[PDB]
Swiss-Prot record, chain A:
One of its GO terms (cellular component) is EMC complex. It is found in: Endoplasmic reticulum membrane. The keyword Disulfide bond does not apply. This is ER membrane protein complex subunit 8. Keywords: Endoplasmic reticulum, Membrane. The lineage of its organism: Eukaryota, Metazoa, Chordata, Craniata, Vertebrata. It comes from the Eukaryota. Component of the ER membrane protein complex (EMC). EMC8 and EMC9 are mutually exclusive subunits of the EMC complex. GO terms for biological process: protein insertion into ER membrane by stop-transfer membrane-anchor sequence; tail-anchored membrane protein insertion into ER membrane. It is a peripheral membrane protein. Belongs to the EMC8/EMC9 family. InterPro entries: EMC8/9, MPN.
Swiss-Prot record, chain B:
Belongs to the membrane magnesium transporter (TC 1.A.67) family. The chain holds residues 2 to 104 of 131 of the full protein. Residues 22-42 are lumenal. Its main location: endoplasmic reticulum. GO terms for cellular component: early endosome; early endosome membrane; EMC complex; endoplasmic reticulum membrane; Golgi apparatus; Golgi membrane; membrane; plasma membrane. The chain crosses the membrane at residues 3-21, 43-62. It is a multi-pass membrane protein. It is found in: Endoplasmic reticulum membrane; Golgi apparatus membrane; Early endosome membrane. Part of the endoplasmic reticulum membrane protein complex (EMC) that enables the energy-independent insertion into endoplasmic reticulum membranes of newly synthesized membrane proteins. Preferentially accommodates proteins with transmembrane domains that are weakly hydrophobic or contain destabilizing features such as charged and aromatic residues. Involved in the cotranslational insertion of multi-pass membrane proteins in which stop-transfer membrane-anchor sequences become ER membrane spanning helices. GO terms for biological process: copper ion transport; magnesium ion transport; protein insertion into ER membrane by stop-transfer membrane-anchor sequence; tail-anchored membrane protein insertion into ER membrane. This is ER membrane protein complex subunit 5. Residues 1-2, 63-103 are cytoplasmic.
Length: 195, 103
């Protein structure tokens, strides 16, 4: 089963990682339920301590309420480590992956690397882990998960060059300040306009 | 606003000094003339009181701090995100460093 994702979600993930480069970041990809797995968009969950179930329950239940409003389904959950020389999945990541795999039959664990994380990204710089309820832990050697690569580079370079990524909002900022949303409307407008 | 109060205080002080000089001149004249046990003019006395009341109004406005008594209100806006990071322990191992290294 191939894994395909739109440039919008990848830009969201990279941008959320850029927002907090000193702490670990967390995100949740969303697909469409109706063999290849297509990802629609991602939402950033939390940042910082990143070892708490209480707020995770709130966030995941809110996302579930969201997915039953516009007829969506939670695809998978992605996590980046704090240390640069760290590319191994933590226990919380596997627990969340199993929790999402109970419902959906296709949950990929996305790992953002840190060693190949610069302004001029080469290309893939994503680790796709394929986890289950059993002891199956395999990561794909190298495949193509993005649709158009040169256009993706142009938009990513424009987004990272121009300092317009301070507006990205997380679920924690929603609790701290109700006013900011969490769908990132301006980011969607920019991804549509740049194309 | 504070500058206006400071200027008003200075002007009042100058007026008070001028009233003092006028009273000094009046007493110097009085010492010239024998007897004549009279008081200083009431107009300059009223000017002195006007200068005294004006200078006591800005002297209170210049230093008004009146901080809140309760200790919870200043930390009512502060977020735990800023508290999480500390200035003692700072690990210099992040992806931004290698991302900003070329540029």
């Amino acid at each position: 089963p191939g894994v395909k994702l739109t440039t919008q979600a990848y830009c969201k993930m990279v941008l959320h990682g850029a927002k907090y480069p000193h702490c670990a970041v967390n995100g949740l990809l969303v697909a469409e339920k109706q063999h290849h797995t297509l990802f629609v968009d991602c939402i950033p969950l939390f940042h910082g301590t990143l070892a708490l179930a209480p707020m995770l329950e709130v966030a995941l239940t809110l996302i579930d309420s969201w997915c039953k409003d516009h007829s969506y389904v939670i695809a998978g959950y992605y996590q980046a480590n704090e240390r640069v020389k760290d590319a191994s999945p933590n226990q919380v990541a596997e627990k969340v992956a199993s929790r999402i795999a109970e419902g959906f039959s296709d949950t990929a664990l996305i790992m953002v690397d840190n060693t190949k994380f610069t302004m001029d990204c080469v290309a893939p710089t994503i680790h796709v882990y394929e986890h289950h309820e059993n002891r199956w832990r395999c990561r794909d050697p190298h495949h193509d998960y993005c649709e158009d690569w040169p256009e993706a580079q142009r938009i990513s370079a424009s987004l990272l060059d121009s300092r317009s990524y301070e507006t990205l909002v997380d679920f924690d900022n929603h609790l701290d300040d109700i006013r900011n949303d969490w769908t990132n409307p301006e980011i969607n407008k920019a991804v549509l306009h740049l194309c | 606003a504070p500058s206006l109060w400071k200027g008003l205080v200075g002007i009042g002080l100058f007026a008070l000094a001028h009233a003092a000089f006028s009273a000094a001149q009046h007493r110097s004249y009085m010492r010239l003339t024998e007897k004549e046990d009279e008081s200083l003019p009431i107009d300059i006395v009223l000017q002195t009181l006007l200068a005294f009341a004006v200078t006591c109004y800005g002297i209170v406005h210049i230093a008004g701090e009146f901080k809140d008594m309760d200790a919870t209100s200043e930390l009512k806006n502060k977020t735990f995100d800023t508290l999480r990071n500390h200035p003692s322990f700072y690990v210099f191992n992040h992806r931004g460093r290698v991302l900003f290294r070329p540029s």
